[PDB]
Amino acid sequence: GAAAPSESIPSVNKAWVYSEYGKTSDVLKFDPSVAVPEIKEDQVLIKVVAASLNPVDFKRALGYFKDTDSPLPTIPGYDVAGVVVKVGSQVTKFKVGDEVYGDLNETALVNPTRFGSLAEYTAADERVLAHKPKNLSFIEAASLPLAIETAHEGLERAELSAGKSVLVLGGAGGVGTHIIQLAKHVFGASKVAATASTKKLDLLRTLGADLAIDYTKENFEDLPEKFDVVYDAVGETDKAVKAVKEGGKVVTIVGPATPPAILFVLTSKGSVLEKLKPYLESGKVKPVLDPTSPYPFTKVVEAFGYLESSRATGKVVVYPI
Ligand SMILES: NC(=O)c1ccc[n+]([C@@H]2O[C@H](COP(=O)([O-])OP(=O)(O)OC[C@H]3O[C@@H](n4cnc5c(N)ncnc54)[C@H](OP(=O)(O)O)[C@@H]3O)[C@@H](O)[C@H]2O)c1
């Protein structure tokens, strides 16, 4: 992995951009000539192959965390998979040519980059990246980081460990599909229960849920069964706290959290992906793509519209970029 020739890396590229906060249908525009970010010394430049969308992209674009956001205009997109083309002088873990993936923003809600993954090139901290598993496509790899790390961190915060039971509220989304798989296949849960609507229950069982609960037909919190861990991915901590065992833990990713539930926001770390690599290589944990994926780079507004419907099954990915 010798340095690319310098003339070979462009200083402008195509990207999606918004210059004011609002709905993606209103503010998100294609710009054919946006600056390529200059890398810091602990960053790499990536030729983007694929990018995933996350709810945070549209919540950010609505201005929900303007006080700690980076300055507009913004090129959105947290999740990336692609090929390193340049490395900073302090980088030791990657070289030119490495295939990598990660969630660009260490702290999602505090100073996320101005130069996201919905662009031909992006700059990424070494610390957020991992080597792409050889058996995963770039679409599949891009689908993973933010969701799989959020799943992992929430389960660790809830102290899940072998033999325990877990209930997942929102099993069929980007995050929930990983909460199920990790709980069963990485944390050794004895029983995994999860909620979704009627047509999504077989998917939950396929991913590792022992009990798939149709929230449109029954109320999980009224079941006599109580769980060691409850992981809310839908914003119903009021009910989640009613489904936990005394001494158990409830975590949510959608606040506000009703004590004793806690809310957290993930910390993006390549080391988490690296820890998960064997499960990804063996297929014990699988990417989960929405049937509408991939969306071409021309169709980013449509991809966001679909995510914003709250009905995505696994991940919405944009490819080819
Ligand atoms: N705090 C953090 O660090 C963090 C990190 C990631 C995500 N988040 C937040 O967590 C939430 C989930 O993100 P995500 O990427 O997984 O979203 P997503 O992929 O858009 O979630 C879509 C899924 O939600 C399901 N769903 C909707 N309402 C439901 C309900 N009442 N019960 C059960 N399932 C329900 C839908 O299944 P049905 O069609 O069957 O309803 C759909 O499959 C978002 O609000 C996001 O902002 C927070």
From Swiss-Prot:
SMART domains: PKS_ER (SM00829). GO terms for molecular function: furaneol oxidoreductase activity; zinc ion binding. It holds the Pfam family ADH_zinc_N_2. This is 2-methylene-furan-3-one reductase. The lineage of its organism: Eukaryota, Viridiplantae, Streptophyta, Embryophyta, Tracheophyta. It is an enzyme of class 1 (oxidoreductase). Enone oxidoreductase involved in the biosynthesis of 4-hydroxy-2,5-dimethyl-3(2H)-furanone (HDMF or furaneol), the key flavor compound in strawberries. CDD domains: MDR_like_2. Monomer. Transmembrane segments: none annotated. NADP(+) binds at residues 59, 174-175, 197-200, 215, 253, 264-266, 311-312. Its EC number is 1.3.1.105. Keywords: NAD, NADP, Oxidoreductase.
